Design a protein around this ligand. Structure first.
Ligand SMILES: *[C@@H]1O[C@H](CO)[C@@H](O)[C@H](O)[C@H]1NC(C)=O
Lengths: 216, 211, 212, 213, 214
């Protein structure tokens, strides 16, 4: 029953932390040129569900791991009962506007929109998604298989406000559905920097390239 | 009688106010929670062999208990439980790990809270998930599986359990296109390379065949 | 014009007095409620033999009465009833027990409150539910059934009743792909070994065949 | 000019605050009935499904009514004679198709125009699926279908309906639709039902159509 | 650095609070305070052409640009901030609408706009649109031609004017492996008067000529 009090105190500690972080000097306005952010992206490809040769749309199911770090989300665990991290609704915090650049339907969200914040200010958010995107599956019924590609990146921030990185250029296939209609030959995820004549600012994306064929 | 009813309303409204808008940041490693899960399988509606997706309709019973939802019935005119919008309370982020479409909710999002702090919530859902129905048109049938668990909490914050490993088939639709050969619901613990925390899921395994 | 303004003020006042003043948390064992249900079947839209789902369009009349919603007309300029958004009041969680898709709502979610505290709410719905249409292409036709009832309240908090066991077919679409041979709506009471309470539903049973 | 438009902006803001607060309207009643004028502009018969007997129309429905509680004197507000407003800011009539098979899909912004005499105009564009047997659409005489529109919850004692014409506006009908329009009418009907002593009013939209040739 | 980033954050948070609260909701354009919206299309894909219903499905980015005096500030007064990103829900946006859609537009990008210190706003929603279009001849060298008008649903030319910076649709991002190739795409401002009404009506007519890729 002291165990009850210790539990009540841990709750108090976490609630205070959250109120201190979110309400005390409130909602972080997103990155700027004077305060840029790096977002790390990683894909875990679960399934190629559908490949439509009449419209050249392919549907993927994946988890997209997003990580970034804000000084405004830092705290000292010692001031809050040694709390080192917490789960919070993604609506409680700023999240990056990472967007598939060649989708053909709105992304469908398959996982709860909850993120983990750690005491150093780092945030991890892993939305599971079903995505329809522009892909010609010609060759999928061959040994060579088909190849498609889709870029992901911020919609509204240039490379001067949001930089992107990957930890590896290999997509995680370790949870790929073993009985999919389609087998994966390769899946890569590569940071690209784009440059345009009009504009001094660079544009950054991550190119997801998947080669696949009908599983015999 | 009408005045006694007026009284009972007042005590209920006061209980809800005392519990909700005068007193929870979810579970933690120091304040962990156990969620009991149980499935009642109503129908295998569709098995798509062109995409390897199967669609189920089930009721998913969720149960957990919070100290912060306890009260003494004697303080509130002998109220021992109440119904409330699921939005009024914390609910667990129990998620199918291999869904291919967002879950469609078929029932009112209302839970029952009991004076001991226990909550029961039973959403009816339609789920599309990853499943190769090959063999469904044979005597042996097809076998598929989908894991449910928290998306964001490890076993250090949320544990899971089932009251039985037998999925409840007593409301399975008798004229479904597919008959159920077996349905099981099993707590599993995953231990990892990366991480020291255990991860818990319940594995729903369905063996079925064309009726 | 002044008197139309007064009738507006009476109604605004009644509504504020009932809603933003007075505290109804739904029915309880000590303050139970009876919901009357009646169905008007408009169309069997689709019958899918590949998945055994059938799609209906109907109006579901719901009626109940709360003391907390009554008033004296003479205190409010002889107002005897009013239309209000269904979000302004408590409504029952009447649910189809064997749907396969979320219900699609076809009508405005507005109810009528009467001075004796009675409420009428008639949602028009399209429902997909579990139904094997085998026989639909035969003289005998097909038969399907779907139960409706509270999701969360047992018979000790919400009782159900019908005014008749005949589904209203007077608005059934004459050029539907399916002709209705019969449609009934019947109150049922069940027990489950889990639980000591009675459970109540209204069973909608439709017998139909392909129009010739 | 910058200051004049600062004023114009302030005056409109004031008008709206003065109207949507300051006696904030519970809809029509038998003592304070309302007439809603309806008219249809049929743009396209998109789809005719003979497997389920549902047909899909695209149209604009012009709705007009007048409330004294939305009147003002333009001279008190910088000669503002009308304004655009979110439909969520005002009362709107619950005009409903009585034989839809799916929820209506809204194709236009839900914004209305209010004029200083209290009159409102709202023109929602809609895609509607309704109960229609397309048998005969592949013939010279075509198919005929109908759908009634009216209030869901108010009788003719609270909301009366009217049309300005019984001819549906076909001047924006898509010329390369799969279906040609042979006729389209919109007719106010009064109905009486055994249940109830009060009159019920609808507008019957009747469309005669065939496959384009 | 942490304290300088704090001041920068503080300057923005204060700008966003001075603009939004403090002279709140702009009630939209009026005859006395009219607005010009510049529109441009970047056509990415013709996804589908349905000849059983005469609907065609397009994916494009629609660039919208307008300027409000109520959104201006002096950068010198706010730590030299010259622009910011904001939720499109934080601001007034124009009710620009396709006049012959057959289904609600599906939004494919974040609803976030960029506000610049001169009071200008840029908003670039990505959309999938189904519209009225007979694709007959798409399987021929001459191809099919369709057209859809874009404009305010509720404001006339007296409140909202429209303009294009160019009559050529941007095809530099058109999907190279689409089922349909683009023969041409133009975006043309049109002024109409109708006998009902004295006000001018303005729209931008998107005209796409296309055929099956071979
Ligand atoms: C902003 O920049 C201008 C020009 O470089 C300069 O004169 C002014 O001092 C700066 N103001 C600040 C940092 O507040």
């Amino acid at each position: 029953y002291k165990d009850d009090d210790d539990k009540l105190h841990s709750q108090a500690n976490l609630m205070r932390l959250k109120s201190d972080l979110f309400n005390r000097s409130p909602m972080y306005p997103g990155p700027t040129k004077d305060d840029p952010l790096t977002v790390t992206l990683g894909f875990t490809l679960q399934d190629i569900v559908k490949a439509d040769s009449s419209t050249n749309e392919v549907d993927l199911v994946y988890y997209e791991q997003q990580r970034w770090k804000l000084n405004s989300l830092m705290w000292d665990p010692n001031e809050y009962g040694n709390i080192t991290d917490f789960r919070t609704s993604a609506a409680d915090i700023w999240t990056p506007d990472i967007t598939a650049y060649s989708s053909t339907r709105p992304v469908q969200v398959l996982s709860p929109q909850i993120a983990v914040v750690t005491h150093d200010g780092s945030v991890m958010f892993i939305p599971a998604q079903r995505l329809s995107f522009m892909c010609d599956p010609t060759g999928v019924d061959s040994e060579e298989g088909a190849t498609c590609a889709v870029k992901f990146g911020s919609w509204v921030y240039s490379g001067f406000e949001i930089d992107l990185k990957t930890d590896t250029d290999q997509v995680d296939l370790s949870s790929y559905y073993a009985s999919s209609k389609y087998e994966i030959l390769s899946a890569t995820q590569t940071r690209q920097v784009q440059h345009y004549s009009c504009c001094p600012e660079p544009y950054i994306d991550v190119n997801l390239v998947v080669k696949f064929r009908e599983r015999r």
